[PDB]
Every structure is written in structure tokens, then in C-alpha cells.
Design a protein around this ligand. Sequence first.
Ligand SMILES: Nc1nc2c(ncn2[C@@H]2O[C@@H]3COP(=O)(O)O[C@H]3[C@H]2O)c(=O)[nH]1
Ligand SMILES: Nc1nc2c(ncn2[C@@H]2O[C@@H]3COP(=O)(O)O[C@H]3[C@H]2O)c(=O)[nH]1
Ligand SMILES: Nc1nc2c(ncn2[C@@H]2O[C@@H]3COP(=O)(O)O[C@H]3[C@H]2O)c(=O)[nH]1
Ligand SMILES: Nc1nc2c(ncn2[C@@H]2O[C@@H]3COP(=O)(O)O[C@H]3[C@H]2O)c(=O)[nH]1
Ligand SMILES: *[C@@H]1O[C@H](CO)[C@@H](O)[C@H](O)[C@H]1NC(C)=O
Ligand SMILES: *[C@@H]1O[C@H](CO)[C@@H](O)[C@H](O)[C@H]1NC(C)=O
Ligand SMILES: *[C@@H]1O[C@H](CO)[C@@H](O)[C@H](O)[C@H]1NC(C)=O
Lengths: 441, 441, 436, 446
Amino acid sequence: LPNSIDSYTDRLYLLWLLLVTLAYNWNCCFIPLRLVFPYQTADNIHYWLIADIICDIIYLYDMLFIQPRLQFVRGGDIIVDSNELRKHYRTSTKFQLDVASIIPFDICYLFFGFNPMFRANRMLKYTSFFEFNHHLESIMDKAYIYRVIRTTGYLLFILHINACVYYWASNYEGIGTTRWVYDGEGNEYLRCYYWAVRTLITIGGLPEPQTLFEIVFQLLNFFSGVFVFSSLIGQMRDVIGAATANQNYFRACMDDTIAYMNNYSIPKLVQKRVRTWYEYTWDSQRMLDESDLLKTLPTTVQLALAIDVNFSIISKVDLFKGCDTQMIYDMLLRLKSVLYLPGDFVCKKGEIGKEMYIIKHGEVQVLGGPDGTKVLVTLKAGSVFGEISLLAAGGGNRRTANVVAHGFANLLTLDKKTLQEILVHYPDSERILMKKARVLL
Amino acid sequence: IVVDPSSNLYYRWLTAIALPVFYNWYLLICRACFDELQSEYLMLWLVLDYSADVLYVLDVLVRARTGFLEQGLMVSDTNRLWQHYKTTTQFKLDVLSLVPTTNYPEVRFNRLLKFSRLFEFFDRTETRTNYPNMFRIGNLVLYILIIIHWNACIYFAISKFIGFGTDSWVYPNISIPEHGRLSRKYIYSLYWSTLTLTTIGETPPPVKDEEYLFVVVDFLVGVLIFATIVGNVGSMISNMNASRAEFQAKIDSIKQYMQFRKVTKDLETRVIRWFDYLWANKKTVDEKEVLKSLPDKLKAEIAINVHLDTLKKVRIFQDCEAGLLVELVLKLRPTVFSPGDYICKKGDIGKEMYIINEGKLAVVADDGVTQFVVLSDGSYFGEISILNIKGSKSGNRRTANIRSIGYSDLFCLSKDDLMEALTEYPEAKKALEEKGRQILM
Amino acid sequence: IVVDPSSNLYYRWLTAIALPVFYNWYLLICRACFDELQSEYLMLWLVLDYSADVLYVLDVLVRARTGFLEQGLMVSDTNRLWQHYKTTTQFKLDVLSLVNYPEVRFNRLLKFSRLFEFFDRTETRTNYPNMFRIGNLVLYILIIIHWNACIYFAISKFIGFGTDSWVYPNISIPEHGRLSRKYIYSLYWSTLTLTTIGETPPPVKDEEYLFVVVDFLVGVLIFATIVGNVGSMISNMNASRAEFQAKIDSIKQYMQFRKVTKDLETRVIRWFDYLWANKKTVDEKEVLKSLPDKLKAEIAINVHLDTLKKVRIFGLLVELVLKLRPTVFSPGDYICKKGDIGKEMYIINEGKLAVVADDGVTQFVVLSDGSYFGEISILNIKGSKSGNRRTANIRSIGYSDLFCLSKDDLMEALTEYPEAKKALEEKGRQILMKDN
Amino acid sequence: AIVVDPSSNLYYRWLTAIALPVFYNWYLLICRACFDELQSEYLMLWLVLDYSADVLYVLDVLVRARTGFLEQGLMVSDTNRLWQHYKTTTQFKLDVLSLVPTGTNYPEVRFNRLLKFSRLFEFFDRTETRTNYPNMFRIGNLVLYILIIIHWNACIYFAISKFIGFGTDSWVYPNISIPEHGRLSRKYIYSLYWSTLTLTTIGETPPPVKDEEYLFVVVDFLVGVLIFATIVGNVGSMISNMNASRAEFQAKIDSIKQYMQFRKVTKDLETRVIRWFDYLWANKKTVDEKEVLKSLPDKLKAEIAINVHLDTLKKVRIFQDCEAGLLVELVLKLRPTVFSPGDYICKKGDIGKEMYIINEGKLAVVADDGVTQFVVLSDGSYFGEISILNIKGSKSGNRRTANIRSIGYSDLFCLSKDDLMEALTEYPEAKKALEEKGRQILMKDN
Ligand SMILES: Nc1nc2c(ncn2[C@@H]2O[C@@H]3COP(=O)(O)O[C@H]3[C@H]2O)c(=O)[nH]1
Ligand SMILES: Nc1nc2c(ncn2[C@@H]2O[C@@H]3COP(=O)(O)O[C@H]3[C@H]2O)c(=O)[nH]1
Ligand SMILES: Nc1nc2c(ncn2[C@@H]2O[C@@H]3COP(=O)(O)O[C@H]3[C@H]2O)c(=O)[nH]1
Ligand SMILES: Nc1nc2c(ncn2[C@@H]2O[C@@H]3COP(=O)(O)O[C@H]3[C@H]2O)c(=O)[nH]1
Ligand SMILES: *[C@@H]1O[C@H](CO)[C@@H](O)[C@H](O)[C@H]1NC(C)=O
Ligand SMILES: *[C@@H]1O[C@H](CO)[C@@H](O)[C@H](O)[C@H]1NC(C)=O
Ligand SMILES: *[C@@H]1O[C@H](CO)[C@@H](O)[C@H](O)[C@H]1NC(C)=O
């Protein structure tokens, strides 16, 4: 119990909000059951009453001891002080819903008899239930499992409410009076839940309604069953579609590429190379275009992720040891990552040079011996190759040697006009790069 | 007078004429089929039909006195309004819907022809009101009850044509006291209609050829029409949930990315908390696309109405020549900064300004956190990248290390945006002189 | 002769050959499974089958003399047309489809390709595409329900009429022995099975149980697919209206969140009411972004050349229409105030604009649809006490529509001929000589 | 010790040869456990198939012991490293739990060897990657899933009917001492009938009378609703997903149609754009090339664009004496469009922003007005070089010198001006050849 709970990073607040959910769902599940079924009898009414006292003191102790500890952001800065937190809570609407939820009808049971229709104000902590849902979906990594569990629980709750309202209709018409109502043989909850399933799923096959109240009940219940079944199967579907929408977008792009290259009759070696690229891209990235996700974010967010991953990779390499930090960080924003299959060339001895590769999670092999098969060095991850193309106008020495990708190399490219427009803003870093060129040649 | 067809007087008339069309469709198909309604409540249908007839005559008068846009101006010449009303097909629909011609509502069945008023009322309300998804659910449920009610009256008319109680499929023998009540007739016909059109089918099977063919055609109309309106209700629920679903798919995508790349946990929770700040303060939507679809004077007026009041409390207040200020208001973009990230680093290349709005940020030093001043709400920082001369300082770089203390929201006035904004003005020169005083002090 | 596939004669032949294919599918399964249409009226099916084989032989002739495209030109030699037709799977299917007596005549169903080509060409040709779409999907579900009715009556004939409870009953009964009740009860059984209502007499044998299981699985999968396609098409019939309503709802959500005042709320809702009631709710260069440049510029010329040929000063106007950009202005709207940076001229298209001096009142001249403005600021008058500025005040009277023309676009479109340059600059010198 | 690789074809052949017994076990183990006649009537057949399945499972462990995995881009072949990386994980734990050794009348003790669902799903993922009809394979895969669910619920209904008692009441399977319901075919096909009518939520079956039957029918209806409606909706989505591309093209056509019917475009031009849509659909040129390859690297995109246009680029006089990197970057920058018959590719005097290369077309150089053909240009040639590259010894600069009309349905390679100037930086020779070609054709035409 601290002085102010940080609601996004508190596992004890997540467990406590779970304990409030296990009182609110107790109320919503066992208020109509005690209200309309003969289960709150003279025997276990003290069991139901001590469960009611436990849930009510969870409500009251939750409000008065956890809710003014909630930190909140006013004007951008995080508010920590307890009087300001208590003022923000007590002049809010969550306090209005909780104080409308905690109005006791405990004075009213002893006057007007024991009846849980008086507990129809305790179903107003839906904002705390939705806060628990949002916090558990923010804590969980695979939130679609909790979303399909929550949609299944919504379906079971609507079937539970329909079972209670069907037992109301059968007790209103009399049990065993007509052929439509519940006959009274077996389990009173199970044989009404079966009717709720076969009505709100709209299966049918039940005994037909006889009189006018049963025809109105069966009409409204099949209509609401059509809409609730359509809406909840649409929710369960959308959830199961948005779970694997990334893999479905990848497979749609892969089938589109394969369909195009099959309609234009490209040979099987090129089709195997494109399928090998798509297989390794889903195997190593789980994503088609990394710039698609790193272009919808702002500049500081993209720069923070870039300085994390790529400044680890470039603080590993020794060729950038004294350059300027904003020039390096704009290079980290400007670094383009491509993937090379095992075997293909990334520089040929004779072509022009416009790229500076920074190898990350790969293995390339330079080849410049007598006949291009002797490996001079095998560059591992976190190295730099392709830096000769700064001086001599790009054509005094175009490309020095062959260099292939020995494995699945994932190089970080850099276009030459982008490197020059980065480097014209830094003449001291240009002098360091000319010093690197003079120690190179 | 000339009724303006964009005014609230015309919308009030669209409400007052979309009431009797709704009445005419529902209760004319009900009265022409259930004879007990027309027999019993005859003074009620004479009063309601006289009211609907005088409102149809007033609709012909209002559509004769309704202006229209020619060369952008409303035509007030009433004879040209009457000729423009005559030269279309709505005049023929109104004349055929207003033919004055006690057990015959077949002469009243031509008063259903004025459906354009009802569809125009639904379109004008769906444009006008602030609860569009609730109105679309109400309009769809109104269409469902039109279809179900009309099919109920078609079933009772087919049962009356075949014969009451001479069959296992038709409505039973209405001379019996249970089946002969009009409320049971209408509610059992609605029960049959919903049970057939929703493809549940808990009705008795047909035994004659026309009942077989009508049940086949009504099953097929029911499955097509009810898959259509089930898809419409699912599309309205998806369009009601789509903004939160798109944001949650964005959070799941960036969390899958940051948990597959193995970034640091503090950077991951900083990005996730900043996105949750964006969702809780509803700044996650962009203004660029929606005000791009809006026209120029309206996007300028709305931008003035929201931004100019915040621009009053900054020092950039200008007593005359406020065209620079309205160009700044058009040239804003609200960007949000999490607490802990730096807005401008010490000694970097500058290309953009910042104007503080609902934030609190302070300059720091190079060694650690040492707040010299705190730039509160209504301040501005930037303006060293406006091509200053070498006055008091050596060169123009971002000359103070400045960090956000809370969740600051800033604007971003770029380089060429400022060179196009504060051109032809000495206000750039006096801003150069105040920032010269800032680099002096 | 040589017919070309993009022609109206080829579309008329696609209709004339899509009639007997649809007839052949529907009524050959009905005849060959119901076995009483034959013995009732053999003569009508004899003359309709003769008409169908005549149209099939003429379809082999038309597909023999149907041209094709190599190097962009229509191939016209009939020997190479016959060779290029004869080397194909469609010629194989037509010569297999020409090999009364309906179980023998089940070969004729192989020409489905002409019916699908008719559906695609009608879809590309007609002006009611969503109505045609849902029409051919209603034809698809009616063909599947009809074929399942015929398959159920054939399995009922194979097992026995009225031997048990599942099958069609005994046809020696005079009520169950009419062809109308046989077809409409088979249609009722296939509707109850394929829409998965159930409610039939239950199967009591192994082949009947297997057929009801396979029929329910085909009904679930295929009818969920096609009736979902009909539902998606009727919900897609209003797509531009739904996109316009989504734009309206998101703009209203922005104005309700950002505390935009009631006057601006009412004015934005009035502008959207104008944009819906005047049918200007579509975006021309957003719907025309896929056309090539010849057809795009030609339809732009075809919709704007009558407006551009009513300008008071112009003779060639082709190179100006494809560089326009139409904007619509509100009533009471200021285009350019007295003294402003001027970057574009405007040509009025069915609008009324005037010139003011006292901020709204004392209008000097009004400028109708056959005029234009903006000829001063972007045109270099090389003097006359003005540079890069606007010396006028224009207020928009009604809902005016006008095309803006940028300075760079007019400079690239004003170098081909100096006659328009000389006339435009002479009118500009006269205008600010009369004003200054 | 030869190490197999998971990107080969022999590993896919092994994935087929091991997804056959996993599908046999998942289909027939619950059926042999729940129908008592399949275990005792057929006895040598399941002994042979179970011996084959156990031998293939032991060989699956011996193959996954020697299956390589990619570390730092390259495959590994250290057998002890592969065995330790295998022995770490839960797939080895599931394989050893699937291969414990566990008369001859109970296959319910053989329920531990349906634990290779990961191997079956790996086969389905690799077939969905490798095949040429992926949407039809996905439809067959989800139809196999709902057939597995219907078969498993049929066997579970017959097991619950056996546990309660045959023919004691109305809901259960009837009395199997009766010779009608006593046959195995009647048992299995009636259990499939009850399973289909429960899981498809039709419910024309006899209703339950006892509480365990009520609980099983409620749980079975809910399992049918959630899982069966999810996979049936996925079947409908994957059938409509291949119609969605043609529906996107048709929605583009209907948007242009409603534009032209709103703006009242004339009839022969409306007919000509309808013929353009009919040509664009009847010649199957609808998929945008650089948009459908918008995420590939430039090497594989250039290999695709060379192996498409190879018969066109072998005829061009540019690409016979130029450099390979210039050829690669130019075919990365070539964006093709298709022109109509009788249209001006270029006017007499215009602002030239691109260069065109012929690709299966036929166009001719017409005069200032009308169709008087001077020189017909077949496939492989090019035009636009005079207005793209500035001739120093010309009578006019950045203006075109000729009128070119297309006679047939031509397809030209649009190569823009700035793309050619950024492609001709370090390749001076081909630029000089185009410069002297433009200079000699301008000295022909003054
Ligand atoms: N030729 C050569 N290049 C090397 C060697 N080690 C690293 N490199 C880099 O490999 C390169 C491949 O491309 P470059 O010709 O551009 O320039 C060469 C060098 O920067 C080596 O031993 N020889
Ligand atoms: N150099 C400086 N900048 C200050 C100070 N107080 C506020 N600022 C702002 O901090 C800045 C950081 O970025 P700028 O160089 O763009 O411009 C500077 C000023 O606008 C101060 O004391 N010194
Ligand atoms: N100054 C001026 N402009 C006029 C007059 N009549 C029409 N116009 C147009 O009004 C204009 C407003 O914008 P511009 O300065 O761009 O150019 C001016 C002219 O094209 C007139 O009498 N004076
Ligand atoms: N000027 C000219 N161009 C020709 C001739 N024959 C083919 N062409 C091409 O036609 C062209 C039209 O456009 P360009 O000026 O771009 O370049 C010219 C040439 O490539 C000819 O005889 N003269
Ligand atoms: C309806 O009931 C009356 C008696 O109330 C009877 O005379 C008549 O025959 C019945 N008609 C039918 C069709 O059953
Ligand atoms: C059909 O009816 C006829 C006479 O009614 C009878 O002889 C025949 O046996 C019946 N067929 C069957 C299969 O019951
Ligand atoms: C099944 O039938 C036999 C005779 O046919 C009977 O003796 C037996 O009791 C029946 N089984 C049950 C469970 O009733």
C-alpha cells in the first residue's frame, strides 16, 4: 500500500482490480439468479449474506482506500500529491458512479423483506470492469486470447440472463401449466439454460408457444437472439481477424507476388529465390515492410528505436568512433535495411559504387584474389564494407572486389546522394571521413 | 415566401411530413389485411387519414414553394419555382399520391408513393444530428420492422384468401374465441413473419402448392434481406468500434515489433505510455485529412477558432499585420512529447520552431539536470535557425539543452514554413532582436 | 468476315449465346431428373433443343472467325484465326459439347464460358452494375437450389417413391403425382436443406443420412458464401454515401471534441448539406486517378471546354483544361482581400462573384460565368506601381465554382504562343491603368 | 551423419510422409476408441497401420535430431549442437511423450501419440507456402478442420451414448441389439448426422431428457457456435478473398461510370473508355508491377523485371552495348502504360518529361495533322531522347520535333527525365551514344 499508485505499472493494482472484477461479476451473475430462482432459501441465506458483505466491503474499501491514490496527468505533468488526487477523484464521474453504486439498501431489506431487486444499483461499476479489461489487455502480450475469453463470457452472460428471464416467464405462467413453460423435472437452471441456448442461438426445436404472452416472449427472444448472435459472432471474428491480420497481409502480398510472377511466366529459379526471400522475411522479421511501421510513428519515436538498435550496432563498429552525434543519428534514421539471399553479389568488380553497407545479422565474404574464389576476409555482423566510394569522383576506383552473401545477409544500405546531403552539414565530420580515406589509400 | 431547403424550417417540415408517410406504410398495409382494425377503430383512421391528406396537400404546396440553386443563388421567382417543380417526376409522384378517391384502402395504397420525403428525412437527419450510429441503428430497425410487418400482413392476406382453418399451414379458425382476437391475430402473424424471414422456421409445414411456393419465395427473400440487414448491423457496430480497434491494432503491432526486436523495457513502456496518453487525451486522430476534406475558409475559420486563443497568450502576439499570425495558425501541427525525451539537443542543426500549448518544459545543462528557467504554457523556443548574423555569439546552433518535464504538446513551425510565413515583414527582424537579447543574456 | 471481341456485334452474340446455356443448365437438369416434362410435351423441348444446337454450331463458327490481338492489331486472316482458335481448350470444349434425350444431351452444359463472358461483359457495359451483380448472384442461388431439388428427386426415384419417410412419397397417389407438386415440393425440400432450417422428415437409411449430411455441409459453406456475397453487395450499393457519411462523422467528432463553436458547427453542417443536395460529393481526380492521359484529358475537355469557350479572351484552349483545379466557394466568402500575395488566377464556372471596397457592400461590378479574374498579380506588367501583390477585393456572392490556375502551370502553358500573352498583358495594363 | 535443411524439398517430402500418420491418428484413434466394432472387426489393419505410424514417429525423432537451424544467416551442421538444441525444447518433450510405449482392445492408451499436431500444422504451413493454389489449399485445409471437428463430435456423442446406455431413452443412440442399428455403417453415419445437426446449429435431432444429456447438448451447441461459425466464416472470407481483386477493379469501373453519368460525357468517348476497360480486362493487364513488388529488394525486383521484359530488352540498341548496372537501374525505373489506337503519344511542340521504349506495340510518325505515316516504329525501338537530353547543336531546346500516333494497342516503357539523368551519371558511354543518335536525327531534320 503506497502513497500514490501508478496505474499503468502496478501489478498489485492489477490484482486488486481483478478482485473488484470478481465482485462486480459476482453481482451481475448472482443478482438475477437469487432474484428469480428459488436458491436464496432459509438455509444458506447467511452464506449469501456473507458473500454480499464481502463484495460490498470490497466495493467500499476499493473506493475509499484505492481510488484517491490514483495518479493522473493534469496539464502534462504527473500529479502525485494526495490532496490533489483526492480532489480530482471526488470531482469526477467515476466517484459519482461508485457513490451511486454504494447506496445501501441494507436498511431496506429488513423493512421490505429480502429481495435482490434492491441490489440493482450494484451493477454500476462497469467502468471499473472496463478499466480492468483495458489494463489486462495492456499488460498481456497476446491480448486476443483474453478478448476471445471476454467475448465468450459476454455470450455466456447473455445466455444466463435469458435463462433467468425464461424462468421468470415460466414462474409467471406457472410451472407445468402450458406446454411452452419449464415443466419442473430436472435442474431448474440447466433446463432453462438449454432453452436460452436454443432460443438465443435461434436453433429452435423447443415446444411451441401456446398463448399470447409466450408468443410475445418467443418473438422478442428470437429477434434479440438473431441480433446478439450476429453481433457476438462478428465480435469474435473481428478479434480473430485482427489477431492475425499481420500474417494475413504478409500472405496476401506473397500470393499476389506469386500470382504476378506466374502470370508473366518467370522461371522456377527466380520463383524459388522470391519464395526464399518471403520465407526468411517472415522467419526473421514477422513483418513485410519495416518502414511501413517506422513511417507512421513520429520523428522522436523512430529516432529512439533507431538509436537503441542501430546505435548498439554502430557503437559496436570501429569506423565511426569520432564523428558527430546528430550526423550519426540522422544516418541512423536514414539507414535502409535490405536482405540478401545466400549466394548473390552485393558488389561486382567493375560496377559503380553508391551504397555503404553496414552488415547486421549476416555474414558476407569478399573475393578479390587471383580468380575471385579466394576469401580475403569473411566479415561478420557489425562491420562496414563499401566505404571506398567517397573520393576519386566514384570512377577512379569504382568497386574493388567481389563480395557475396555467404549466409542470409541483412545489410544496412545508404544511398550516396543521401550520404552527401547528410555530410554537407558537417565539415568536421567530412574531415574525419577524408582522414579515413587517406588511411584507406 | 420561398422555403430555403437548407434551413431548420425545412428540416422541421421534413419531420412533419416523414411522420404521415411512416403511418401510411405501416398502418395501411395493416388495415388492408386485418379487417378488424378497419372495422373497429374507424373514427381513429378517419381522423388520421384526414390529417395525412391535409399534410400531403401542404407537402405539395411546400414543394411548389421550395427554392433551388441556379448559379449559386437561390431562385426566388415563384413561377419559375412552380415550373421547376413541374419539370421533374416528383410532381407526378405527388399528384398520383394525392388522388382523393369504407372497406377499401386500395385507393389509399397510392398514398405510399411519397417515400422520397421519408428517405430525404433520414438522409438529412443522418447528416445533421450528432448521434449518427444511434440514428443508423434506429433507421435500420425501422426498415426491419417495415419488412417483418409487411410480410406478416402478406401472410394473413394469403391465409384469408386460402381460407381460415381449412389447412395446417394457414391461420386457424377465427370463429373460435382464442384465435379470433385481433391482438392474437397480429402478434401470431408477426411471430410467423419473424420466424420465416429470419430462417428459423418453427411454423407448420405447407400442404398446398401455393403455400409451398410462397414459403419458398419468402424463405429466399428472408435469407437475402436478413443477411443484408445482419451485415448492416454488424457494419454499424464495426464502424462504432473501428477507431478504438484501429488504435488497438496499432498498439498490438508496435508491441509485437518491440517485443520481437528485444528493445529495452523502459523505452518500450515509455512508448506504450505515450500512446496511452494520446488515446486518453484523444489527440491520436490527425487534423490534416479531415480538414483537407473540409474547404479552405472553413478549415481556416476552425483553425483560428481553436488555435488563435492559445496564440493570444504567447509573446508572438502582434498588434497589427496579423496575416502572419493567421499564416502561423494555418501552418501549425500539434506534436506531443513524452517526459524525458529532449526536444532540442545542445549544439545541433536546427530546422523547426516550437510553440508551447498545454505543456511544461525546462532547459537543462550538458552534465546533468539543472533547470535554469522553466518555459511554461504560452512560451516559444526555437528561432536560432532563422539565419541570424554572428552577433554576440559565434554561430547559429541550437544553443541550449532543453527537455520536457511533463507530457508537453508542441507545435512545429518548420524552416521554409517560417521563411514563407514571416516574409515581407520586420516582425522577423524584431524576433531576431529578441533572440539576440536572449543570446546576450 | 472477321468480328472483333470488343464490339457491339460481339456483345449481341454473347447475349444470343448466353440464352441457350442458361436454358440448357436449368431445364436439362429439370427434364433429366423429373422425367414427366418429356412425356408431357416432348415437342417443345424438341424445338428448343434444335434451336440450342443451331446456336451452338453458329457459336463454333463465330469463335472460329473471332479475331485476336498480336502487336496491338486485330488479326484478320481467317486461316490463322481458325488455327489460333483450333489450338485451344475452348475449341476442345466446343467440339466435346457438340457430341431430346437429356442424359445423352448432358454434353451441352460444357459451354459455361460464354455465359461467364456474358456476365463479365454485361458487368463492364451496363449502367446498373450492383443491380446486375446481385441479379447474377440470385441466379446462382436459384440454380444451386434448383439443381439440389433435381438431385433430391433423382435420389428419391433411385431409392423408391414412398418406401420410407425421407423420400418423396408414392406417385401413384393422385395428389403426389402432379408435376407441379413434385417440382415445388422438391424446391421446398432443397430450400429447407440449403438454408439450414431443417424441418424435413428425417432420413432413415444410410444413403439418405449421407446425402443429408453432405447437403447440409454444402448448404452451410456455399450458401453462407453466396448469401454473404449478396449481403455485402447490397451493403456495398451505397459506398460513396457511406464514405461521405464517415467523413461527416469524423469531422463532426473533431468539432465536438475541440469545442468548436455553434456558428462554425452550423456552417460546416450547412456546407455538407449543400455538398449532398447539389450532388458534388464525389472527387474528380480521386475517381480519375487510374485513367490514362488521353482519355482523362479528353473527358476533362469534354466537361470543361464549353465553359472555357465562354471566356471573354482566349484560338487554342486544349493545353489549359488539363491543368485546371476546381474549387467551390461559400456565399459571403472572400477569395482575395485588398492586398495579398497572389499566386493563382480563377476562371468562373457557373458562379456569381463581385468586387467590394467597404468590406461587403458597395459592389462595383459582378463577374458572371463567362468571365474570370486573377489576370493582374501573376502577369508581369513590368511597372505601374505594383509587384507581386493583389490590388483588389473580391467577395463570393453564392455557391460559386471556379478553376484555379497556378503560376508555374500558366507559365508552362503560356510559352507556346505569344498572342495570348500579348492580349492578356494588354488587358492587364488597361485594367490597372484605369484603376491606378 | 548428413544434416538435412528445412528449406529443401526432401524435408517437405518427409513432412508429407509424417503428416500422413498424424492425420491417420487424429482421424481414427477416437473412432477406434469410441466405436467398439472398429477395434475388434478390423484387427490386422490397425496393427499394420499402427506399426507403420510408430516406425514413422521414431524416424521423425531421428530426423528432427538432425534438422538444421539458421544461426547468423547460415545453416549449422554440428550434430552435437543440433542434438543439444533439439534436446532443450518442448517439441522434443512432446515427441518423447508421443513415443512412450503404451489384449489389443484399447486404443485409449494410444491417445498420447496425437501430440504431433505441431508437425501436422508445419506440413500445412509449408504446403501453403509451396503450392501454386494457396486459396484453394486454405479452403481445403479449413474444410479438413471442420470435418475433423464433426468426426470427433460424432465419436464423442457415440461414447456418451455408450456410457449412458443404448436405447434407454430418446436422445441416445438406439438399441444395438436391433439388427437395423447394429451395423457399424449405421452407427457411424447416424453419429455423423447427429454431429452435423448439432455443430451446424440446425437442431432437428431428438431433445435431451436427462441432465448429463442437457449439459452435453448445451456445451456442444456452444462449441458449435464459436468454433464452427468461426471456421465457416473463414471459409466464406477465403472464397470471397479471390473475388475481391476483380471486385476492386469493377468498383473502380463503377466509380468512373457514375462520374461519367453524372457529368454527361458523350457517347462515343464513353464507348471508347468502355472499350479500354474491356481491353484492360480481356488482356489481363490489371496488376500493377512496382506496386505488387513494393517491398522486394532491388536485386530480386530487377531479376523479375528482366525475366519479364527479356524479349523486349534484347531488341533495344541501348541495352546491347551498355553496362549491366545501368540496365538494372533503368529496368527498375521503367514504368509501363498502355495506349489506345489513334492517340498522340507526343504532340509537335510540348514539354517532354519522359522517354518511351516500345514493348509489343506498333506506332508510326505522323505529320502535323491527319494520318500520313512517315516511319513506322515496331517493337524494340525508342523515342523521346531529343526532348529528354538537351542537344547543344540544336535549333530548339526542350521542344519535340515530331508527331507520333499509335496505330494499335501499344505498350510503352515510360522512362522519366530526372530518372534518366540520375541513371546516366556514372555511365557516360550510353549517354554519348544517345547524344550522337539525337544529333544525327536532328541533322537529318535540320
Ligand atoms: N578489396 C578489399 N575490400 C575489402 C577488404 N576488407 C574489407 N574490404 C572492403 O570490401 C570492399 C567491397 O567494396 P568496395 O570496393 O566498395 O571496397 C572494399 C573495402 O572497403 C579486403 O581485404 N579487400
Ligand atoms: N541559448 C538560450 N536559449 C534559450 C534560453 N532560454 C530559453 N531559450 C531557448 O532555448 C533555445 C534552444 O533552441 P534554440 O537555439 O533554437 O534557441 C534557444 C532559445 O529560444 C537561454 O537562456 N539561452
Ligand atoms: N484591381 C482590379 N482587379 C479587378 C478589377 N475587375 C476585376 N478585377 C480582378 O480583380 C483582381 C483581384 O485579384 P488580383 O490582384 O489577382 O487581380 C485583379 C483583377 O484580375 C478592377 O476594377 N480592379
Ligand atoms: N524529329 C524526328 N523525330 C523522329 C523521326 N523518326 C522518328 N522520330 C522520333 O520522333 C520524335 C518525337 O519526339 P522527340 O523529339 O522526343 O524525338 C523524336 C525522335 O525520337 C524523324 O524523322 N524526325
Ligand atoms: C370453424 O368453426 C365453426 C364453429 O365455430 C365451424 O362451424 C366451422 O366449420 C369451422 N371451420 C373450419 C374451417 O374449421
Ligand atoms: C403406391 O400406391 C399404389 C396404389 O395406391 C400401391 O399399389 C403401391 O404399392 C404403392 N407403392 C408403395 C411404394 O407404397
Ligand atoms: C434391446 O433389445 C433386446 C431385444 O431386442 C432387449 O432384450 C433389450 O432389453 C434391449 N435393450 C435395452 C437397453 O432395452
